[PDB]
Amino acid sequence: MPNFFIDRPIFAWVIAIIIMLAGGLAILKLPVAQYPTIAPPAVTISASYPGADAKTVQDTVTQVIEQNMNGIDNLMYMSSNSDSTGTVQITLTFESGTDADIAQVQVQNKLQLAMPLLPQEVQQQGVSVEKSSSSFLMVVGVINTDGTMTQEDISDYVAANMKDAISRTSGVGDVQLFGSQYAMRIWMNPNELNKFQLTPVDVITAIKAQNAQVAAGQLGGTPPVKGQQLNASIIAQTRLTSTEEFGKILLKVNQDGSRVLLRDVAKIELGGENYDIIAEFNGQPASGLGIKLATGANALDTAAAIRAELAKMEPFFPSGLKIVYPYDTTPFVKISIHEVVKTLVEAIILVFLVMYLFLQNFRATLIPTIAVPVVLLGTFAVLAAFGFSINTLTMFGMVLAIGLLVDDAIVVVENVERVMAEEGLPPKEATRKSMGQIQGALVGIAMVLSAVFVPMAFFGGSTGAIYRQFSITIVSAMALSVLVALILTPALCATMLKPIAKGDHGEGKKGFFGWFNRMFEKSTHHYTDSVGGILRSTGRYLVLYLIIVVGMAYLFVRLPSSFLPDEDQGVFMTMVQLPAGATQERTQKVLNEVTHYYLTKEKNNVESVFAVNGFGFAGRGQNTGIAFVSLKDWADRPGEENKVEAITMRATRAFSQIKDAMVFAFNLPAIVELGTATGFDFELIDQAGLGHEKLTQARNQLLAEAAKHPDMLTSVRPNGLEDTPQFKIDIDQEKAQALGVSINDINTTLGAAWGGSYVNDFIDRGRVKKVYVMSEAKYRMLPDDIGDWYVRAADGQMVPFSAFSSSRWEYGSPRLERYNGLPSMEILGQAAPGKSTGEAMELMEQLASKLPTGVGYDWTGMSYQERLSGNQAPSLYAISLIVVFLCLAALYESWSIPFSVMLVVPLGVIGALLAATFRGLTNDVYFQVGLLTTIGLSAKNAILIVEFAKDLMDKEGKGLIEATLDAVRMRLRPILMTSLAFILGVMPLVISTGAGSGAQNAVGTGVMGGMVTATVLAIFFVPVFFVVVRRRF
Amino acid sequence: QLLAEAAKHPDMLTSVRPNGLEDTPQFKIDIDQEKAQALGVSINDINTTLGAAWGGSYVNDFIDRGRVKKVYVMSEAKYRMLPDDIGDWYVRAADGQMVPFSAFSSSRWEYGSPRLERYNGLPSMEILGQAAPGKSTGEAMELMEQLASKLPTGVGYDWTGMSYQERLSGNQAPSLYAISLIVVFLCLAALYESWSIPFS
Amino acid sequence: DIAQVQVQNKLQLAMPLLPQEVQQQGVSVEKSSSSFLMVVGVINTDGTMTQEDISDYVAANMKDAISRTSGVGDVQLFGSQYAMRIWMNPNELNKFQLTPVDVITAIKAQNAQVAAGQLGGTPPVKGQQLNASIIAQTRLTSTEEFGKIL
Amino acid sequence: GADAKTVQDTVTQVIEQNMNGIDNLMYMSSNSDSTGTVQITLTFESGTDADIAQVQVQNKLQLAMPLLPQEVQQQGVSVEKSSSSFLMVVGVINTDGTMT
Amino acid sequence: DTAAAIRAELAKMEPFFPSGLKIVYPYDTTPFVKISIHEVVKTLVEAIIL
Amino acid sequence: ATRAFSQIKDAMVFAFNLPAIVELGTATGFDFELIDQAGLGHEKLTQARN
Amino acid sequence: GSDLGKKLLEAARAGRDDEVRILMANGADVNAADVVGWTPLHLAAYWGHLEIVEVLLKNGADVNAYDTLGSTPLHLAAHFGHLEIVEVLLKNGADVNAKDDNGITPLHLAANRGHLEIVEVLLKYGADVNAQDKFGKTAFDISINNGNEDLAEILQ
Amino acid sequence: MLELLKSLVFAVIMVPVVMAIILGLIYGLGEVFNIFS
């Protein structure tokens, strides 16, 4: 090929132009996002049964669905939660690669067939099916400076005048609203109902009968009489809009001719559907819009469009009402991507400088600067083809591929200049000769790096979904690099270079560069003499090789594992939890204390605090809450002490010394899907119908026996709520019948009064809204109020609840949970320092094997994957080693020579294990990929050394030692060029404090150290291995 | 206003017309619950009588020739025609009293839309047209774009169907020639190893 | 996977037109072959339990986990799940001036979960210290509780 | 039994909001009549799997039936691919006047 | 694969079956497939040797 | 089995081995469907079948 | 109210003997009540912690404590079938005929759930069988309705 | 337009320093392996 493009350079320029245009169009048409679809596809069925507890809901709703959740394809598992708020959440999780639409549909369809078995209240509220494995691209907040508009008014304004616009914006895929739009609240009074001998049932029936619709037909409709010259559509009683209209509703007419209307007996207002959740923003009432991004979208342009629409609409808002942005992770993405782009450009500038430094030719430097961007743009086009995006993982794969690109260019240019200098040849024939030397080397390098990287794509689960990005990115980059080295760089070196003859260019020039040539010649001669002295006795160095292998194995074992490193995304989360039996008042007190803390003792760093009451992840009840703490930009807070980890530790210190509560501060995980580093998720299941009580007994016993193994386990705990007090009302039917009371009326009164009842719909100005009847706070707040509620018998007399209803206290679960249709308890835990996940995950099985009968167990989350698809890395890397050995045998046409190369894998590896060990890192994804990159570079250098030596020995008969010394002499220059360029292009990733610092450092450390060690060691041990293998065989 | 402006252009636009229906008279019947309750009559019985008598009432099914068909209860034509025909329709009270609608029902006329259109979540009105013979459709679309520019504020315009795709055909074209030229130029320089043979 | 979707999108229009006795029992739209992949029998080696008692175990503990397995499609049960079966005697009903409708209403009334609300719920008063879910009427779990039905 | 102004606020506008945010949507129209009949037509880009489109719409729609009158649900809400123009028009006639 | 999944699932309740219950497989079509494939593989090896 | 079962009274008992493709039946068999397209009924259709 | 009493309540609820001893040695209150009126005795009996009941009793835990609705540790011990708890409570002065806001006594509770081993003790310790609840029913009617003829014989 | 000049400054500064560091490491390892002989 190269001899086809040296004589045809326009062909090569044309291919390069085509690749550049492809990549350019791609970078315009490529979606941008922080992370790809890593977590497996899930779907959440959310339901609500107002006024119910956990058991009522688990019985009438959850079990019914779960029994009809059959016949769905690719299902990994499902887990159900049932809260005392009536809420139900059934999360199904499917095998990776599944289509999150067809699965959602199968689920919605099974549920649509199951609905007729649910009670009318659930069919009437609504059972929704959503996709769970997503996260809020943004959260918009809306507040009022004045205390006029409250939470519900702001929520209504949002639902009406803002949601539809945000949804009609580009890229916006899903828009959830925090808070509920207006709703006609009807707070009744039992005293004033008994006064008129009424009941809540009468209110319900009147409201049902006096707000409905009526079809009334037409005038002159078909079939008409012969002669009709007129037709008209009739309009009968329709829904009501105002509040007075609801006040004018008749309930009863007395013997004295008086009229009974609602406005006399029932305080009517325009409130919300649920007050369970209360949101505040720096103490000010607020409402919110959570925005999940769509498929194939650009988060940046999407957030820009959203900020533009909200700005357009701001001027049309009420007075004092304004907008805010608590949770916006878009700036973190912008900075993290801009940093990688800057790094890519610096890696070109550094290549230019290095080339000009060693090769004083500017026309030589011009070449890599043209060859590397072509490859990057071609890689972008390749991604666009396969359906990938511009994300963190892809760009970090590119900043690791740049080294391979740089080597593929620099080896060619350096060898061409070397030939032109030694043999005095001109550019064209020199390029012919150099490519004749380097063709098979580049091809075998391509195959080797493919064998090294492709095996990662074929892992299982989220781990594999992550590794696939790096793998495909780097393979595309390397393939385009090899095609470029065979196609374009030769033609460029033929038409751009200039002639030099018979001179090492180090004695005829003066200045820094002449002196550098002098010093480099001296150092080359010294390295040559050292290698020559080495090759006289080798075992003295094979022993050092074995020592290094032992040391790197030790460092590998004593290095802690990980999944991904936490970062500073400009936000973090505080979690508030209270004892059993708390309320809104106390939780809001605690949250206001939290806010006062952050806004006073962290003013220098914190900007806002968005507190959501009644929303914890461990529970969506009433004694729980959160705070989305938003920070300033990384420019307005420098220093570790002003970062998120120190803030978190300080906040935990200031909040652990608190009263009657449990407050924690933590950092937003890397991927909102919590994949811990060494923790697990253990489900304890009831396989025999034991119950909640025996299952809780077994849970407590297991936690006890787990606290006795702190050497392997720690922080073991349940991920649920503990039983709380519950008020039991025992009705007697004998009295209810004697007095002539309908148990149906009894329970309808009780419910509609204490929990709430959704009756019918009404039409506000435009949109349609609900109607909720309920008691009034001061009449549904204690047991002493039970006897203040009356029912109506058949004979007409009114009866108090106290006549037939005894009462007790008991204990009951506020949040029940199930795993695959059977009751369960979720348990969390970490592996103790020095131990891994497998050991603890096997210890927990050993423990659970000693539990009562009927109790079983299972694994969820990362523990599922880690167990089903967590032991296949050795097999694929064995495949890799075998393919590499075979490709090297083909290249060298020998079964033994390949070892000379496959023994440099440790030399770089250890250099990465030392650094990561010094700087205090772990064995995360980025480290795992930098390792392979350094290994590929070391193998590249070794392959060229070996092939040069072998070509000299075979086609010139120089001999073993002479050929090897000549090879290393010719190969020093490019090795150092590539190593220096890569080390410099990476160093910023190591000295980094700000956005993406964790991933930057994890990528940069293990490759800086890797190349540092692979350059100054391989150049010595590779000749040793080569002469060893050739003298043995 | 737009249709009036267009009717002054029979050389470009012809057959201009909206794809809709004009506002029409509607007959509202107000039911007074108070008087029906005073007379022992139920709101629901009244609604059912009115519906069955003026619009039909799907009751249940039946079996004709082995197939399942419907059963509709309805009034005779001569009792559904005029707003003065109502009042002949009576009801049974709790006692059984024949109560006429004329006691608790009032009536009036209004104007309303029998068909409301929206386009991309916004109120809209569709207008179909042809190009005048001899002319084309691009000329007519240009003229209509002009006319819709003089209209009041807040009134935007858009194209649908053959007028949307057509628009693309007019904007794709430059980006289609240019590229189709470049790919040729390059393809020649490669085959003939020169930047000049292409330029000639 | 698309045929099922079209079929069910069409059947969701008919479902309302069906009686409630058919909806309650549950309409199924399965996507499966017409031939048994396999049969899985369950027996007693001790002769302790009988057909009904094995069928109940199979249904309540084994049918639901297997019908969620991937590739199954449809599962037929060679038995029947337990159910509180109530055998009426017409002579004893006439002896007490009763009919099956009375029994049905009494069961639907005295065997029911009810949404009884919260004790201390929101929007609450200023200064509330207690919150507690109310329990009023639970489903029945044995024949003893069904007998006591008045 | 609905005036178009009603249906355009209690059924149509309650669905249209959900249909914003689909993969390859090009435009959409909607028509609310005096007989209550509602037709919301979504037109996608050329080359889309019309089946996957119907599917995504079925998915974005169930987010709304929680908010629709029971008289809409009990009558059925159809999500079906569409075409504006007829392929054929078959006619059936009696030649002997023995029918109407 | 489906029969494998089914056997794996049944292997998770067998520990929890009350005293007396026993699983049995009176009708399975899958073993015949695996065996008819193993026999053809045996044929291939025999033919290579021949 | 079929021979020893024809000697049973008040029953049709037939044993058979399932074919290779259970979705395909007897070789050279035929499945035929009589249909009523005029509103005749089950009785006249039974008469026609017979 | 000191958090010592609250931690004592929590430890009794969770079954922690060593922690309860540690707390009482620091002088923790035992008449302490939850927001519903349940002292450590109610919690230790409800959940069945005999050791905790003995510990709390040795240090002056009011056996006759009553919650906001007339419930006592004896009521719960009888309802949930904790024979040892019943015996221990009576040894130290548990009013076997304690009457709640509804007139229901440990007899009616132990009879509603079929606890004969407990009705024996209740009776022989002086439990009035004819004790009527609010509606007019006794342990005899509660045994006839529940269909426990054995109990009805135990109560003649 | 100012960050790139800072990067180029960093480069012109470190390139020779990093080169000298690597060359000194090579010289040290060479002297070591020469001592080993």
Numbering used by the authors:
A (entry chain B): 1 to 1033
B (entry chain C): 701 to 900
C (entry chain A): 101 to 250
D (entry chain C): 51 to 150
E (entry chain A): 301 to 350
F (entry chain A): 651 to 700
G (entry chain D): 11 to 166
H (entry chain H): 1 to 37
Source paper text:
AcrB is the energy-transducing component of a tripartite multidrug efflux machinery that includes the outer membrane protein TolC and the periplasmic bridging partner AcrA. To investigate how AcrZ affects AcrB, we determined cryo-EM structures of AcrB and the AcrBZ complex reconstituted in a disc in which a bilayer of E. coli lipids is encircled by the membrane scaffold protein saposin A (Frauenfeld et al., 2016). Trimeric AcrB cycles through three states in the transport process, and DARPin associates with the subunits in the loose (L) and tight (T) states, but not with the periplasmic region of the open state (O).
We developed a procedure to reconstitute purified E. coli AcrB and the AcrBZ complex into discs using E. coli lipids and saposin A as scaffolding protein (details in the STAR Methods). In the AcrBZ structure in saposin A discs, we noted a previously unseen, significant bending of AcrZ toward the binding groove in AcrB, which was most pronounced in L and O states. The bending mode is also predicted by molecular dynamics simulations of the AcrBZ complex in a lipid bilayer. A structural comparison of AcrB and AcrBZ when both are in saposin A discs indicates small changes in all three AcrB protomers in PC1/2 and PN2 and TMH 2 and 8. Channel 1, for entry from the periplasm, has an altered entry shape with closer access from above the membrane surface in AcrBZ compared with AcrB. Even though chloramphenicol or minocycline was added to other samples as well, density was not observed in this position for the maps for the AcrBZ and AcrB structures in the natural lipid composition or AcrB with cardiolipin supplement. The structure, together with mutagenesis data, revealed that the overall bent shape of AcrZ is being recognized rather than specific interacting residues, which also may be the case for the transmembrane interactions of other small proteins with their cognate partners (Hobson et al., 2018).
